[PDB]
Amino acid sequence: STKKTQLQLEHLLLDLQMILNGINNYKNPKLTRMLTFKFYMPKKATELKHLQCLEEELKPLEEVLNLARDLISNINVIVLELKGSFMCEYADETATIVEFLNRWITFCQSIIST
């Protein structure tokens, strides 16, 4: 079971990085506008069950991306199966997509570590 859990986190991890990598590649003017959009961050993220804060922001992430269906689709399956279908509490300060994706990329790394 533990190994199955790990592999899933790694795919999730890879996934978020590919979306971030493609964003960084954009031409600055495009990146400028895209950076104006705001995302919501979790107050805490240490348990697999916190992965719900991510789920609630997938739609927004999908939408913004659109303006710049399958990549996000995978992340959805992973999250749904990983956390198991807890009230997610957000921070006061909103963040940029780059910040957003970084936060969760670290999350996955921290968990895989344990």
Q: Give the CATH number of domain 1-114; options: 1.20.1250.10, 3.40.50.10800, 3.40.50.1970, 3.40.50.1000.
A: 1.20.1250.10
CA-to-CA distance for 96 and 83, rounded, in angstroms?
Answer: 25
Helix 2-25 × helix 97-113 angle, to 10°: 160
C-alpha distances out from residue 64 to 26, 37, 96, 97, Å: 14, 8, 11, 9
Method: X-ray
Does residue 10 contact residue 74 with C-beta atoms inside 8 Å?
no
Can you name the residues that pair with 95 across neighbouring β-strands? 39
In terms of C-beta distances under 8 Å and separation of at least 24 residues, what long-range contacts does 84-91 make, across chains too? 84/49, 86/49, 86/50, 86/52, 88/42, 88/50, 88/52, 88/53, 88/56, 89/42, 89/43, 89/44, 90/40, 90/41, 90/42, 90/43, 90/53, 91/40, 91/41, 91/42, 91/43
Place of tokens 């936060």: 103
C-alpha distances out from residue 61 to 56, 66, 112, Å: 10, 8, 24
CA-to-CA distance for 69 and 76, rounded, in angstroms?
Answer: 11
Task: Give me the residue spans of the domains in the chain.
Answer: 1-114
